Every structure is written in C-alpha cells, then in structure tokens.
Design an enzyme around this catalytic site. Sequence first.
Site, PDB file in Angstrom:
ATOM      1  N   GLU A 173      -2.125 -10.022  -1.133  1.00  0.00           N
ATOM      2  CA  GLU A 173      -1.059 -11.020  -1.038  1.00  0.00           C
ATOM      3  C   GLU A 173       0.185 -10.235  -0.640  1.00  0.00           C
ATOM      4  O   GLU A 173       1.219 -10.806  -0.294  1.00  0.00           O
ATOM      5  CB  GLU A 173      -0.815 -11.707  -2.387  1.00  0.00           C
ATOM      6  CG  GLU A 173      -1.380 -13.122  -2.492  1.00  0.00           C
ATOM      7  CD  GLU A 173      -1.155 -13.742  -3.864  1.00  0.00           C
ATOM      8  OE1 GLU A 173      -0.321 -13.218  -4.631  1.00  0.00           O
ATOM      9  OE2 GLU A 173      -1.807 -14.762  -4.177  1.00  0.00           O
ATOM     10  N   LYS A 185      -8.630   0.635  -3.333  1.00  0.00           N
ATOM     11  CA  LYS A 185      -7.299   1.124  -2.987  1.00  0.00           C
ATOM     12  C   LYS A 185      -7.324   2.153  -1.856  1.00  0.00           C
ATOM     13  O   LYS A 185      -6.276   2.579  -1.368  1.00  0.00           O
ATOM     14  CB  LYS A 185      -6.629   1.732  -4.223  1.00  0.00           C
ATOM     15  CG  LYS A 185      -6.547   0.776  -5.404  1.00  0.00           C
ATOM     16  CD  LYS A 185      -5.640  -0.413  -5.119  1.00  0.00           C
ATOM     17  CE  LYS A 185      -5.554  -1.322  -6.337  1.00  0.00           C
ATOM     18  NZ  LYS A 185      -4.578  -2.424  -6.144  1.00  0.00           N
ATOM     19  N   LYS A 222      -5.067   0.285   3.780  1.00  0.00           N
ATOM     20  CA  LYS A 222      -6.247  -0.511   3.447  1.00  0.00           C
ATOM     21  C   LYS A 222      -6.671  -1.345   4.648  1.00  0.00           C
ATOM     22  O   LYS A 222      -7.862  -1.473   4.942  1.00  0.00           O
ATOM     23  CB  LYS A 222      -5.940  -1.434   2.268  1.00  0.00           C
ATOM     24  CG  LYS A 222      -5.644  -0.692   0.982  1.00  0.00           C
ATOM     25  CD  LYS A 222      -4.871  -1.561   0.016  1.00  0.00           C
ATOM     26  CE  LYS A 222      -4.407  -0.744  -1.171  1.00  0.00           C
ATOM     27  NZ  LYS A 222      -3.443  -1.500  -2.002  1.00  0.00           N
TER      28      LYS A 222
END
Lengths: 216, 216
Positions: A164, A13, A73
Amino acid sequence: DIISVALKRHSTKAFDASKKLTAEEAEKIKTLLQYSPSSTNSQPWHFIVASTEEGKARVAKSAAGTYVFNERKMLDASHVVVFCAKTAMDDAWLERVVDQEEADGRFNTPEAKAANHKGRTYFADMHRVDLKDDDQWMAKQVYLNVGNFLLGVGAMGLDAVPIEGFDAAILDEEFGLKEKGFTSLVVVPVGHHSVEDFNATLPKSRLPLSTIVTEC
Amino acid sequence: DIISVALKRHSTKAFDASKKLTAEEAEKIKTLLQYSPSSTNSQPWHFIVASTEEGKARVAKSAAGTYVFNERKMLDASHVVVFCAKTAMDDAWLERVVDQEEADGRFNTPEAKAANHKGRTYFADMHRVDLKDDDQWMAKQVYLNVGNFLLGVGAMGLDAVPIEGFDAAILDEEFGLKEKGFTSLVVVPVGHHSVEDFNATLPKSRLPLSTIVTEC
Ligand SMILES: Cc1cc2nc3c(=O)[nH]c(=O)nc-3n(C[C@H](O)[C@H](O)[C@H](O)COP(=O)(O)O)c2cc1C
Ligand SMILES: Cc1cc2nc3c(=O)[nH]c(=O)nc-3n(C[C@H](O)[C@H](O)[C@H](O)COP(=O)(O)O)c2cc1C
C-alpha cells in the site's frame, strides 16, 4: 496443509532477482486473479502483471518519496501485480457479467438468468444510487481478491508482499488507468525471497484470539 | 493443488444442517481469521463465530425482509463467521499491535520497535488525519481477510458462502458492535453443502483474461 501455509507465508522484504516464476506458475497466478469470488460476481477489477524489466521499472516509479523503501521489492521480484478497481460501475459491465455467466451455462432457464440479473442490479444500484459508494464497494472486492491471491501464491510455494506503500496517482498516470476507468490500489510483487529477507525468519505476530474472536 | 481449489470452491447455496465442523476444523478456521495479513499488521478487526443454534439465530436476525433469502444459509451452516471492522483507528489499538509484535520477538532493539511504531503511525494518520478515511481503510483490510478465509476453508475441503446480503444495522445492534467500536461487513456461513446445493455443480464463470489482465 493450508493452515501450515497461513502460519508460514510472510511479507517478503527482499527478493532474489535471479529467480523467475516458471511458465506454468505465471499462468497459474493469472488464474488466481481471475477466479477470485466477488459480490454478485461483479469482478470490478483489472490487473497489470509486470514481468519485464521496463514493465517493473514503470510500476516502481510509484515507489517515490518516502515509499522508496518499497522500490527494490518491485524491481527484484519476478512478476509484479497491480490490483486495480473500476472507478464506476457501468451497466455495460453488469450486462457483461450476466452474459458471460449465460455463455458459461449457468442458467438452465430464462427465469434463472432474469433472477441473477435482478439480484445484481439490486446490489449495483444500492451502491451506485442509494449509498453513492460503488467506488468503495468495488475496491473492497479488489482487496478480497488480494487476500485470495496472497494465500494462493503462498500455497504455490511462491513469495510475495502486499504493498500500500506506493503513490497511486503516479502509478495511475504511468499506465493511463484513469482514462481506462480504473485506479490502482495494491501492488503485489511475487517471486522468491532471498536469504537477505530479514522477515523470512522473524516469528509471525497477531493479537490473541481471546481479543479478536467472540464465540456464540 | 491450490489452483484446482480456486477452480472448484463455490458459494454454497444450501448447507446440510446435520454436518458440523470437527473440533479441529473449528480451531483451524479461527487460526485463518487470526493470521490474515493486513496493512501495517493493523488487524483492525473482530470476528463473531456463532456455532450454537441460538447464536446463529441472533446473526440470522440480519437476514430480514429483503435479505430473507440468505436466512437459511445462516441457520443451517455449522459455524457462521461475522467479519467486523473497527469504526475508527484509535492509538490504543496501534499500541496493542506493536506491543504484541515485541512480545512475539519481532524486534532486535528498542529503537527497532520505535521505528516500527512510527511507521505504522504514519500510515494510520495518513488515513485518520489527511484522507479522513480510516474507516474505509480498515474495512478493506477486513475484506482482504475474507478473501484469505474463503480460499482457506475451500482448501480445507469445507464449504462456505460470503454474504453481503444482510442488514448490518440490525446485526450491529444485536451484538452491540457500535459500542465496542466495530461494524459488521460480511457474514460467512461455513459447513458442508447439501445434495440440494445446485451451485456445487454449476460451472464457474469469470470474464476472460484478455479483458481483466494487462501483461507488461
Ligand atoms: C493491504 C496491505 C498493504 C501493505 N503494505 C505494505 C508496504 O507498503 N510495504 C511492506 O513492506 N509491507 C506491506 N504490508 C505488509 C504488512 O506489514 C504485513 O502483511 C503484516 O505485518 C503481517 O505480516 P505477514 O504478511 O508476514 O503475515 C501490507 C499488507 C497489506 C495486507
Ligand atoms: C463480498 C461478497 C458478498 C456476497 N454475497 C452474497 C449473498 O448475499 N448471497 C449469496 O448467495 N451469495 C453471495 N456472494 C456470492 C457471489 O454471488 C459469488 O462469490 C460469485 O457469483 C462467484 O461465484 P463463486 O463464489 O461460486 O466462485 C457474495 C460474494 C462476495 C465475495
């Protein structure tokens, strides 16, 4: 132990932006993408491997709207892989696969090549004509590639996170994928997690085997 | 060396019917199935693991007519895994996932659990309501699990072969998956190849990186 890897890898994360893959690791993750298996060895895919600041920033453009929680990220990771699937299975690509296998010496006789071509054609046509779902079929092969990749980078000691949560329309336009015959499905930043990655220390959670497995 | 594994694992064409997985290996392949990642940790799957002769025979019913050439792989292998996906994403399952994560200690506050739940619901509805493709979305998670699985068993020194060449309608009927809310996607026999497994010696073939990869 690969099982230890499976039990310890996690979705990162937060990445340490100062840690880059070594030259060898960069070559190795590409090998992982390339050698994943696929139905009939159709390899219905393309990968964008972004490692420059501008390159990653371009991919990060897809982390718009509510997907902003995934922006860092993409920006902080060392290498960001965009997994893409072909939008349609063309004969040219099918011939490409068998001609490459021939070139690689997988056929001892002409009959061996013909049988391989016949088999591929069967599956290709079943999806392109009978079911009209080759787009879905190919995307499934891409997800299989992702699964292979995540465990592989994990086994290499590298961190990553499958994503996603991005706007594919935006990502596709940004890299002109549509015109090239591809569409983005999953984005996977790869690198090293920072101590600020809260998910690095949370226990993994999965439903019990008694629920997901049936033995016979 | 996970890369060596990727360059060496192969789709087994013949299994030694006398070589079975050890009790430990059997436990480990199930762990691999269970711990695969998935979008929102939705784990939209179920696995049938047939290890008895009768069990494999039932699965082999799907290797009918057109697919009879895959029957022996299903019968001679030690353990045969049938990867199944949920046919629809129900709220009941989403609840199960979040409650398991809480039991596993992944939340520091009740508010944290709710936030995790809302987020999962958002992705779930995006597919169930908006795109109306939650069936394909979940099938993709299963293929990712397959990808994770194949590299994992390869890394265990075990042989296996992913199979799309089977009749899912027949397999679904045989195990009453439809009623359970599941559908068969991929069959993966696992075991040890026999000396006759010629594909163990043929060189691997993939298209070149200059075609499949774009570095940015
Ligand atoms: C196809 C796919 C898409 C995912 N998308 C996201 C995402 O957009 N952002 C994020 O932080 N995690 C994302 N995840 C991570 C999941 O939440 C995670 O895999 C799961 O909770 C299990 O935890 P683990 O990966 O640490 O084992 C995704 C995972 C998969 C497999
Ligand atoms: C989803 C999927 C379905 C496949 N189905 C079959 C099958 O029905 N029978 C078979 O012998 N091989 C099958 N294969 C094996 C492919 O032909 C193989 O993965 C590919 O040619 C690359 O070779 P490799 O796995 O040895 O690296 C399948 C592979 C995947 C990934």
